[PDB]
Amino acid sequence: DVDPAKRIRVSHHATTFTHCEIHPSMILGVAASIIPFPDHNQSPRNTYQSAMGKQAMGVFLTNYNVRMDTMANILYYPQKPLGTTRAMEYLKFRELPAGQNAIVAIACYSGYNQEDSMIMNQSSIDRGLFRSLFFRSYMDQEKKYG
Amino acid sequence: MIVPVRCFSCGKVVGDKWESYLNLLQEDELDEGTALSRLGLKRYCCRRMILTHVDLIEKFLRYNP
Amino acid sequence: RGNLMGKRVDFSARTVISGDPNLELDQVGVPKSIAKTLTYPEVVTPYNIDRLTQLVRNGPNEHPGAKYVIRDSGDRIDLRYSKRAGDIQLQYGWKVERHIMDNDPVLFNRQPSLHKMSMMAHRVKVIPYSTFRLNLSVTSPYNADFDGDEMNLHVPQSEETRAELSQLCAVPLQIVSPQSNKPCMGIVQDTLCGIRKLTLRDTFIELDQVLNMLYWVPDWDGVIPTPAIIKPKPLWSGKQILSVAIPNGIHLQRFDEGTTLLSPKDNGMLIIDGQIIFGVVEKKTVGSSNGGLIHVVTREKGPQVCAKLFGNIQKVVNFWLLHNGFSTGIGDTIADGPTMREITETIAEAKKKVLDVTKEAQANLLTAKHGMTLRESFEDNVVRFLNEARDKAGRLAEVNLKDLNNVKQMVMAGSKGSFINIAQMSACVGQQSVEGKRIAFGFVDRTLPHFSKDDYSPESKGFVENSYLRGLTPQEFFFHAMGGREGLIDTAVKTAETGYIQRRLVKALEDIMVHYDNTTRNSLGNVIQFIYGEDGMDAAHIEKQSLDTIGGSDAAFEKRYRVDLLNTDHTLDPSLLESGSEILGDLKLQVLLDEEYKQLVKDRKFLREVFVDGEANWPLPVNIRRIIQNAQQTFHIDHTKPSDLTIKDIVLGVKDLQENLLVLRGKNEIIQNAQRDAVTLFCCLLRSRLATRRVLQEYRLTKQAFDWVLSNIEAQFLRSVVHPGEMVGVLAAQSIGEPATQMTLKKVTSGVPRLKEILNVAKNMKTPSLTVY
Amino acid sequence: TTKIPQIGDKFASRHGQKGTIGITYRREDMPFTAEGIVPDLIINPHAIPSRMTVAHLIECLLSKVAALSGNEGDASPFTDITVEGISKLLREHGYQSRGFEVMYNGHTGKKLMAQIFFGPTYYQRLRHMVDDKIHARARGPGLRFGEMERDCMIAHGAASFLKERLMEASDAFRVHICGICGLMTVIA
Amino acid sequence: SNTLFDDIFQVSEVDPGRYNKVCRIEAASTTQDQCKLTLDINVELFPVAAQDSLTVTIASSLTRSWRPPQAGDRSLADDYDYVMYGTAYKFEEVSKDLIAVYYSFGGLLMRLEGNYRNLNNLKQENAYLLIRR
Amino acid sequence: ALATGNWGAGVSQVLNRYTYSSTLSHLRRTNTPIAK
Amino acid sequence: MNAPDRFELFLLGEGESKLKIDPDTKAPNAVVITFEKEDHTLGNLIRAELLNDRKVLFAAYKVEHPFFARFKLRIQTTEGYDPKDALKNACNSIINKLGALKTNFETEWNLQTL
Amino acid sequence: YDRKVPSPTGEYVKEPEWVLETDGVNLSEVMTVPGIDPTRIYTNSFIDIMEVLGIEAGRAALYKEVYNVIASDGSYVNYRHMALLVDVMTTQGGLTSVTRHGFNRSNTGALMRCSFEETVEILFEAGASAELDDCRGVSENVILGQMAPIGTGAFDVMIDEESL
Amino acid sequence: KAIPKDQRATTPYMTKYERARILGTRALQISMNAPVFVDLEGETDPLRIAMKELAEKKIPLVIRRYLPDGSFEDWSVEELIVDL
Amino acid sequence: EEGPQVKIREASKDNVDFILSNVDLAMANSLRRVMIAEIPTLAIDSVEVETNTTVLADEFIAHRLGLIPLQSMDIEQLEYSRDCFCEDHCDKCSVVLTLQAFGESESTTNVYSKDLVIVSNLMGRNIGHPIIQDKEGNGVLICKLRKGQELKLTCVAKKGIAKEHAKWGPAAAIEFEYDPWNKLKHTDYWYEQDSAKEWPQSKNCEYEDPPNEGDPFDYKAQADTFYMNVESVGSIPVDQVVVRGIDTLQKKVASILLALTQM
Ligand SMILES: O=c1ccn([C@@H]2O[C@H](COP(=O)(O)OP(=O)(O)OP(=O)(O)O)[C@@H](O)[C@H]2O)c(=O)[nH]1
Ligand SMILES: [Mn+2]
Ligand SMILES: [Mn+2]
Ligand SMILES: [Zn+2]
Ligand SMILES: [Zn+2]
Ligand SMILES: [Zn+2]
């Protein structure tokens, strides 16, 4: 009499337990720890995400205006993901997000979003959707042993 | 950084309700959902706009230079 | 050596690509900024003195402009820095380096280029925003999509060089490729999904939209077709409007499972005179399929018409799809509550079988097959039970999904998705594996510290009972990640290894060319093949045709080809031919008719020796079946009247034609014999298709239609012959390498490792087998 | 420098599937819902079957619900949250349980024969953008023609092009040679 | 200006087959028992049920573009309710001693099986279809 | 050695700073020089 | 950088006219008008109206490429009936239809209490 | 295995036959065993087929092997491309590999692609051997500032003096 | 090494290559103000003109097809049957 | 008055829930598009930054400023800057405003839109006034300052349309629906077990007659009677958005008859 919606599990055939997992989601690292419902994805796609996430724009630190580093991308209006993870809490994601909750439609429209491409609302882009800052700093000196 | 002036999707002015949302939470001890609804924000596009914002300027303001 | 690696790249730009449904197949969207950097040295002549003058005035900053004006003496005038930029008088013979403009032939390439079709010429279409644009159907040959990819555009610099691109490399001239004697470009994604919905019977359209759709097709002749319905409302059919896109003179018959002339399922395909008669249009018909619509138009109407066909079909469907809409969501992955109870039980049933084999093995009652371990037989059975389970559980999920289910819809149209996909999303994911076995005991006698030692059950060694919808258990998750990892690694290897093989293949066959004597030779002039592909034919002119003579019972063979004027029961009924009644008992003709039969019977023998398997469908030049169907359409042949063909007409005619299908023309004995061998197979096909009875009883051809068919086969045959100059070598290497790159995946070494073991001529094979009958 | 989203910029969800902006449409032209809601993005359905990224469809459903209910959407792995459980809550909000919605075409106002899976979904803007890779090297007086590009033109049979693209700028010096000895010892 | 077929039919089966707007009817023939008919019909614009009686005529007249109004008020050469128009890919099966022809109405198929139509059914495209009550 | 990444290598790298989580990730990275 | 200015969406550039009328060859009494600096708002509107006219044999509109703001309107009419007239009749019929709506609205707006 | 054979009436019919697959190969001897069909024996080791059945037989096996490797993924390649490769590998009466066998070339010319950081050493040997460059390659023709005798350049064009 | 106009075994048909180079060479001359042999009924693009000359058979060129042994055959463009 | 038919259900200073009737879907939809993208309005389109010690960048603040709803009542009495015969801008075609704020107190200093000051002569026309609707008279929160931080700007409002930039758009959202009962069958409902049971019933189903079981498909019924609901952003009265929308579309259609004239 189990919920026909939950995932199936194997009944406990042991009364010898010596330990218990604090929580299975801790088998993940910082990156995968940010994927929503990873247990519903094909294995390889979780890997791709853990890589791409490192190419996202957010707010790497709150003191960016003071650091003079080579390159930096600060997302204008960072949003906290509507769909989070319990691990996210310790990853400080809701505090320093890297994305926006866009209203997403899954449709064939004019056909200008085929083969892994996407149509974006221009009007939204005007109100600041996905705008970002981009800093680049140069360095130079003077003489050497001359 | 700060409350976007308009909602990205429809443009409905939303950048004039941040402080109200905050009070509706602390002072009136209302829940997020019940709060956004009392601010006239009914369509999920506008709701997300405020509910998902991250007021990083507060921490920015905490610097001296 | 620097120029042997593309170091000094001049006159070429590179950027991100994007799909564009409003561009023609042979075009390429070149952003204005990029067109302002690339130039072409054009000579001043009375044909352009005017335009050239305007460009120079537009300068390097406005688009239709130029960057330099070179004078007779060779002096360069920099149009951006010159006290006379806007004060020049072009003289005949001078040169003007103008910006690339609309319709200039430009080479376009997506690396890695291991396919000649990775470098095709495209007409320039200058447009606003950055990024190069392409028609969706050029995507497959370039093997690109639009999520970051970047291609290169090259601007030819001379007049001869310009012609070479457009006369050999032009995108239209590549549609039908020699790699697989079939098209390599076809309708994809949306258009494919949208075309199937459009073609369904229930799909009707009202006047308001039909007019817009008609108008979207630029080659429309302004003649509004009459509705398939005139009654209470003038209603049209999706098929009806789609046909406006298909040109006149096209025929396409295709019979599927139970497809009948009244295909209830709206199965198969039947396009007569450029009008679809019956069948839902999908990948089989509009895809890059072998004998599909695209293959036909290319041959029937030529490359340019075919190219235009890609754009016409796309405009009508994309338009129709933009107002119909299509989507996909979680819903599309949910199977019926009762179906789920049938699925869960199917899996439980499999876990019972595995449990019985385990008890059997633990009792030592189970026996291993010859040359096989006890444990091997055991594993072999559990994995079969489990895969069998996943598979059957998958079908249950699919059967349940309705024709409305979007996932099921994309699969029916042939645009993304397949069974395994539905099966894992909706029902059971399946058994995970690494190195062809279930997950191994990495800890001592157990797969994970969460299980007990010696647990050989399905949950223990990687069976994922759950679907993607349901979500994996932490153990199923880790197991699946171990399976998955193996794929990421094998892909890196498959990618690294194939790339090297592809370069070794080219390098070895790079100097092999077809010479004027139809001989294939290397740079030393050594003969590799006395005639190319042992038939002297061009692969892009070869189509899979069935050799009827070979198959069937002898009775069926005789009932179809035998003609006996000397027998009241086996002569040609007087209704099949005018001279019907006076042909009876004609000794002299019968002698001619026995010659034809003996020749066909000889062929049957011959073919059964060449194809011991009995296989009848083989790729050949000149599609006879089509030429015939065309003839009938072209001459409006009515099966209700006796032909005016004489028997000598057919026999002697068919005989005379075989003497004109030339591959080799040498007047000596040797060549004439080599010429008879190279046309032996086609000739066996010919005779089986133009056998007197077939001509009179089946085709009902007239003297006119028939005569037309003969000259056609000749024109096509000669047209299918390989051209001296073909770099057949390089072609061969790339034809073996490109697809070998697409090898990402019983117990015999295959895939890349085998190919690398074959091309290396290794003395120590991994799996030295011997098959003994 | 401020960077506004344009055509060609990268974007992706947290499910391993990127995509560049193919084009931009104003709100008017975008398809719309009865409530007047319009999408900020439009991804293609054909990007769903093969990848089998169910999580993405679920994130959407959960996100729709979270935004309407004001609660954070738990998308943590290995929990008892279910699509069915998420559907009920969504339904309790007046929407069709599986995230679908009726939409009207922006060009005609007329409806769509199909309902669209519509809901919010987290999207990441990636770096490495168009204007940072646009190279046009065409001096007057990737991006290369290497050994593989040469093999291709060879198969096409385009010898002129091959010679044009590989002929060094060096002067086509004129020399004289003996027909007996292939040497340049001829005093001209 | 013509007419090529005329008769009344007894609908014996109306199958919708996974469709939602079209059904495949197969009615028997009055008078002659030989004559049969299998036809697809847009039920939404003219419902149909079992044991019904349909008067079916083929005709071939009353290719230039197409006009909606005016003529649909004047030369209304339609004394029927259902009116289709298709092209004949006629495969005279010459089955035994009967003659079955084929018509295609924008994908909607039709097939008659008789023999007294020798000098009736065309061998060309132009072929309308009329049914009433 | 701390500036190069040479020990006896790529042992030391410039800290990632693309996104916060990307920095975290780098600080918990692992490398294996050179059967399965 | 390659992106065109926003005003180009509604502002006619130099050497441009609001209407380009050309004779259709594929059919008699047909014309193809190119509306510059306009989109679906007008195209589908004038289109839908031209269809209410019974003496109009053909009416369709299409924007060949979303990058540019312009659309093509093709019209076919009975002999004697000028296509440029159907466009006039349609335009006027719209202007009137809209004018009436503007009035009926400013009226119902008055009878409101808020 | 099911075997497609002509039935006594003429039409092809499936007739099952027992077949033996072995791990290990010794063609020359197994072939000689009584009760088998030496006419149909086979092995995925084309090398043994060559040494035992001759080069021609070898060519056919080498083909069948390449073919299976590709037909394995359900892919198809016109016969002529694999036939060409198999012939090149067999022309000299032996089984020559395609994966860079010779430390020098494959079938190129000395003046061709400047392979190796030292083309000079290749030049010395060419001189001491009286090597003769046909000049049919691209690279060699590039250095000579000429188009290669390939495709479009496989013939010459001359002005005509007949056209009135 | 020359081959009599008789005894030519090579194809009567023009090869795609031959045609491509002929259309290319001829277009080079047209672009360099060289005289045209066909009535220019509007055409201005050199190649477009070259093609018109090929059809009307007014290109005074000859293709020297060499055989692998050194010998060669001489075919006149006019003579070559164009159908590709 | 024959023709289109308005039948208002609700009305207020922010929304106009009405029911267009006796009209073509095309017109209904055209008006819907015009309200969204072609109704003239005034909005900051130039910002001169003198002093900025705030935590935000210039373009960041600039961007937001332009998004601040401005009074556009008499927007018709303000020429388009591109038409105006002056050099750059002037009172005839533009409204100039200033923003001066200093971090004086110790607590964070909020810079709202109320702090904007018109410096040009409005000439008596209701225009340029920063729109305010919050129960505090603050309006839109532009920026925030820490003690010591300063911000001195100069904005130049200009008349514009949404087509050029969403900021110039007077509308917010626009509900649009017709045939709440799928009688026309313009859509094919997706379902699992029951089409009707699974799909939420619309508000407007009440304002209409449910189809009758037996009645066969009415193949002639067209699409009339559309249930809309406009929502103003504030720069213009709700009723105005509609009215002016109807008027603007009317102008375009006219600009064409005039083209035929001079053609
Ligand atoms: O036409 C196509 C395109 C892509 N794919 C499949 O897409 C999957 C990977 O999908 P990705 O989205 O990771 O590939 P990509 O093409 O964007 O990758 P890069 O540009 O970064 O190299 C791979 O499994 C591939 O075979 C197809 O199967 N067919
Ligand atoms: Mn991809
Ligand atoms: Mn890609
Ligand atoms: Zn909103
Ligand atoms: Zn000498
Ligand atoms: Zn002014």
Side-chain angles (χ1 to χ4, degrees), chain A residues 3-10 17 21 24 27-28 38-44 46-48 105-118, chain C residues 19-22 133 136 139 144-147 189-190 318 321-322 325-328 344 450 459 465-466 468-474 477 480-481 484 488:
Chain A
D3 189 321
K6 286 177 177 177
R7 64 198 59 172
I8 306 168
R9 301 171 190 180
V10 206
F17 290 126
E21 296 284 2
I27 57 184
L28 310 181
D39 50 353
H40 288 265
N41 270 322
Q42 167 185 35
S43 188
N46 281 320
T47 293
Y48 297 164
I106 297 180
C108 309
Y109 210 53
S110 64
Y112 276 81
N113 64 328
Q114 310 195 63
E115 289 295 310
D116 296 292
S117 81
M118 55 159 270
Chain C
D20 193 322
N22 293 305
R133 302 213 145 229
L136 267 117
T139 253
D145 57 17
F146 318 111
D147 53 36
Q189 311 247 301
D190 299 332
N318 292 353
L321 191 61
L322 170 62
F326 186 71
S327 199
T328 290
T344 303
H450 316 269
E459 312 85 39
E465 183 175 1
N466 289 278
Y468 282 141
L469 169 58
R470 254 181 184 152
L472 288 58
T473 57
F477 185 86
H480 185 45
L488 297 169

Side-chain angles (χ1 to χ4, degrees), chain C residues 436-590:
Chain C
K437 311 172 165 183
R438 342 221 309 273
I439 303 306
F441 290 160
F443 282 91
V444 188
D445 308 304
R446 53 180 174 159
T447 54
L448 284 182
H450 316 269
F451 290 102
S452 186
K453 299 194 176 184
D454 297 337
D455 181 350
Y456 291 73
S457 72
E459 312 85 39
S460 175
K461 302 178 77 72
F463 178 68
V464 165
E465 183 175 1
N466 289 278
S467 63
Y468 282 141
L469 169 58
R470 254 181 184 152
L472 288 58
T473 57
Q475 297 102 298
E476 297 178 304
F477 185 86
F478 196 74
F479 288 156
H480 185 45
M482 292 165 81
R485 175 82 117 240
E486 204 188 22
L488 297 169
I489 310 169
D490 292 356
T491 287
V493 166
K494 245 78 182 186
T495 295
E497 277 188 57
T498 298
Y500 174 68
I501 290 184
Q502 200 279 337
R503 300 217 190 192
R504 298 295 122 182
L505 284 180
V506 170
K507 182 179 156 185
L509 315 176
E510 187 178 63
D511 67 331
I512 303 167
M513 161 188 264
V514 168
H515 287 251
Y516 284 92
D517 53 23
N518 281 279
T519 226
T520 305
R521 293 190 220 199
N522 64 193
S523 53
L524 307 167
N526 287 333
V527 169
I528 294 197
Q529 298 186 316
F530 290 82
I531 204 175
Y532 176 54
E534 322 172 357
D535 64 23
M537 228 60 111
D538 181 312
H541 297 263
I542 277 164
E543 320 190 27
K544 176 165 273 176
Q545 298 178 71
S546 94
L547 292 155
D548 304 313
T549 17
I550 193 154
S553 72
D554 296 322
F557 178 83
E558 188 178 60
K559 290 191 175 190
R560 181 190 228 165
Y561 296 94
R562 186 56 187 178
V563 174
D564 191 27
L565 306 184
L566 312 178
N567 189 157
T568 59
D569 311 308
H570 307 306
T571 306
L572 296 142
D573 185 285
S575 58
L576 297 174
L577 166 52
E578 311 185 319
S579 58
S581 62
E582 65 185 308
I583 230 78
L584 234 191
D586 190 316
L587 297 161
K588 297 179 183 182
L589 296 187
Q590 250 316 296

Side-chain angles (χ1 to χ4, degrees), chain C residues 56 112 158 179 379 663 756:
Chain C
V56 179
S158 76
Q179 173 175 293
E379 287 302 330
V663 169
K756 226 268 173 176

Side-chain angles (χ1 to χ4, degrees), chain C residues 645-656:
Chain C
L645 274 147
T646 311
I647 283 175
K648 291 194 168 194
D649 274 346
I650 305 181
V651 187
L652 295 175
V654 171
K655 226 180 183 68
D656 179 51

Side-chain angles (χ1 to χ4, degrees), chain D residues 178-183 185-186:
Chain D
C178 159
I180 303 185
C181 75
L183 307 178
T185 56
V186 185

Side-chain angles (χ1 to χ4, degrees), chain I residues 8-36:
Chain I
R8 272 130 108 226
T10 286
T11 10
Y13 297 75
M14 179 169 292
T15 69
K16 53 175 104 159
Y17 301 117
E18 284 156 2
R19 174 184 131 96
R21 179 139 182 251
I22 285 173
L23 283 179
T25 289
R26 184 72 196 112
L28 173 59
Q29 313 167 326
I30 296 182
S31 77
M32 291 191 310
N33 312 296
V36 169

Side-chain angles (χ1 to χ4, degrees), chain A residues 16-35:
Chain A
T16 28
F17 290 126
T18 53
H19 298 73
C20 166
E21 296 284 2
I22 302 187
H23 201 97
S25 61
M26 300 312 241
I27 57 184
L28 310 181
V30 174
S33 248
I34 290 161
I35 305 172

